[PDB]
RNA sequence: GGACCAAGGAGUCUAACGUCUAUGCGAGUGUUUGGGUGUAAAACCCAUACGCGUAGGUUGGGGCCUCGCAAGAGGUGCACAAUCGACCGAUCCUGAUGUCUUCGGAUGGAUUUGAGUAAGAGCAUAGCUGUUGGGACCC
RNA sequence: GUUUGACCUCAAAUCAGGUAGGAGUACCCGCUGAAAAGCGGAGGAAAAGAAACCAACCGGGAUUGCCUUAGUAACGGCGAGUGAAGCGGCAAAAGCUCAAAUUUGAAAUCUGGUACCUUCGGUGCCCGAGUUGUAAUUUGGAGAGGGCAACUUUGGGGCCGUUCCUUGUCUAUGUUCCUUGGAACAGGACGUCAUAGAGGGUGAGAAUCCCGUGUGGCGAGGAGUGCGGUUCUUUGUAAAGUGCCUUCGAAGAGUCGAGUUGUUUUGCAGCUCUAAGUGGGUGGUAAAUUCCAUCUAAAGCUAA
């Protein structure tokens, strides 16, 4: 009736990502290559801009924030490949 | 359509259970040591109640482990959270009084 | 008694597998401690018999009404008109120390400690960095604990 | 709830929705050509109140239909009427007029700046969110339970303080 | 509609509202989900909740008192009724003191309003009955 | 090397050992489904069940069931009527296991065969299975590695009781006189027992005639770890727990989700598309480029 502060229990899923799992995911990325709509998607970025790219990706996906992450990820792939 | 003709009978059977279980549990109570816990829901928020189990941190504040406390007959809930001071303190006093009144055979 | 099975079993020469249970389900033996088996009465109840013991039968807040069973006379308020024993036995039994045995040491490893006691003596930093006869590389103080247990066992 | 807003611009309004009626029942009993140009019927001033005036403006911008509508070569006598009753916009749909459309009872809540975030510029205090109504119900019930418990306490007091003593001349008084 | 005769054979039960009556308690009332108890489907006891309810005048006038031998007279007046009130809520005007330029309701009106205030009556059980529904008097 | 052998796959065995079916089906669980029937699958219960919960509070805390919520919310030609749930009180209460980083200083794991033994098994030996991962340890409430300080703890048998089951046996008092009657168990007179006057039989209403009934007693054969004594052994640098310090600190994807179709009244199913990792789910909240709450889905078991 005055106060008492509990120790807040945060799930270990909500903590962070490890170095290990980032290595795992990125190492899977170059091995798996691109799916065919991703092969379309990099080309569609390079041709008609991220506006139409995000729109086509959202059409391929269900929602919009996933289309953001997908377009941003393929931008990361283009930045990792083309400059480097 | 169903009529509880056995309302007199089942109670008898239930007390038979409350007899028979007690036979196996001969020194110990039938029920565990439950927390005294204030209710939700503003209609009931002045009401205090029997709770399920205490917490880990409270049983540590009592001065024992919950894994051992289950052997002593103290009901323990991990998923509850202690957020009120007076609830916590009153239940700690409850735990201490329960510790005072038990004698444990080796 | 109108199923074909029950009528045939009635008319059969086998006879009913009849067992009587309803008398003996009320009475129970307590099976657990001979002390409570002594003070158990089979007449009062679980509740009255635990109360007569002194042990708290149910923990908390019984639904319903207990027997206040007329121990005292209660008089009306005028509103200011104008002018233990078996508990003690179990407490002794739980208070009784059991015949316990000290956890001793095994012969090979106390012989190992005996080798260390003569190789290094008493000092621990030398025997910690000993390769031969410390191949498990024991912890600094585990060495102390085992040697003190060995000395209390044998050799002061 | 809904928002309708110009997504690069300052307008942002939040309206509450009551009393919906669908195309399923006989309340419509007719279809129209999907894509005919709508007519509006502002059965209210929408002039004297500046925020209602902005509401009327943004409903014009919203519900105004350019000729890029398909099947717009037909005009299906389509008209929608807006009527502030007390402060609730009853919105009806007609096609002589027969109600052929869904039915609204609509309620203003708040007006804020920007495209979806910008600071709250206007709010009508007349609206109550129904969560607050449920909260009133629960608070009143809790007050009733509190009073009932206090009354039960005082009843047990009065039952304790209700006892009248015996006469000094009675058999129980003697004995 | 019928040869006769015997037996069988047709408004039962339950649920939800409703009146009446009886009973207990009374602004409270309701033990029996359940617990305790027991001579054990009985009876007995009952913690916490829950349910439903609760949260002025005049005229008369039962009586009663006084006086009157009586007849009658005077006084106080139950229930209830009528009137004139009052107040609350509404009703449509007044729109002050203030006033963020549209906020505000102060005061005074007006009719009706309402199982409204102006000193409770209900809860529970039983019985008889009204309406409805379950096959619902039977075929 | 045209040879030989590892594997891997696939066959065959009158090879060894096991197992499936059918009946019943009151209750349970799935599938289908009209104006219920049917199908499939179990058990003494089944199911469900240890929060990707409910809430908005001074928060609660697996599931199940009862009373209340309540004929309310909500739905419905808002017609017919349909019809919840949170909380509260109670009964009952119980929690656990995987899947993620190495044991790498030794696959430490197990089936099977055989030889013995104290056999719901044990030991030995040998084939196999298995690294495309069987053991120990760890399931977030963390946990692990160490280190420090201490403490604290040990397991397995036997036997005899007890407990449970199935039985067996023993344990009161009139057959006293008279009448009636074919027959006294009827009627009258005088009695005895009783922790036994329940019931039945005996030629009519039998406490006392018999069986029982009531109270206790003595057995017998099993079940069994429930505990209670004895008795035999169990240590091997074995296993575990608590506080402090140090270094780390990995989890359910054709899934989540989106659209559509059917179905249900929001789920489910199909088809198409199809993710994230300070992630995700869900709900309130706003003085708003909001804050806060609450759980961890896509693996499993669990009495009452």
mmCIF file of C-alpha atoms (C1' of nucleotides) in Angstrom, chain E residues 33-35 47-52, chain F residues 66-69 88-92:
data_model
loop_
_atom_site.group_PDB
_atom_site.id
_atom_site.type_symbol
_atom_site.label_atom_id
_atom_site.label_comp_id
_atom_site.label_asym_id
_atom_site.label_seq_id
_atom_site.Cartn_x
_atom_site.Cartn_y
_atom_site.Cartn_z
ATOM 1 C "C1'" U E 33 -22.367 -24.813 -3.506
ATOM 2 C "C1'" G E 34 -19.620 -26.141 0.376
ATOM 3 C "C1'" G E 35 -17.334 -27.267 5.552
ATOM 4 C "C1'" A E 47 -16.541 -19.382 7.964
ATOM 5 C "C1'" U E 48 -16.157 -16.353 3.610
ATOM 6 C "C1'" A E 49 -18.789 -14.791 -0.268
ATOM 7 C "C1'" C E 50 -23.268 -14.309 -3.139
ATOM 8 C "C1'" G E 51 -28.633 -13.101 -4.196
ATOM 9 C "C1'" C E 52 -32.965 -9.343 -3.572
ATOM 10 C "C1'" C F 66 -19.732 -26.922 -8.206
ATOM 11 C "C1'" C F 67 -22.392 -22.128 -6.537
ATOM 12 C "C1'" U F 68 -22.480 -17.079 -8.109
ATOM 13 C "C1'" U F 69 -21.424 -13.895 -12.160
ATOM 14 C "C1'" G F 88 -15.502 -14.059 -5.894
ATOM 15 C "C1'" G F 89 -16.673 -18.562 -2.636
ATOM 16 C "C1'" C F 90 -15.675 -23.901 -2.591
ATOM 17 C "C1'" A F 91 -13.954 -28.925 -3.883
ATOM 18 C "C1'" A F 92 -9.273 -30.643 -5.247
#
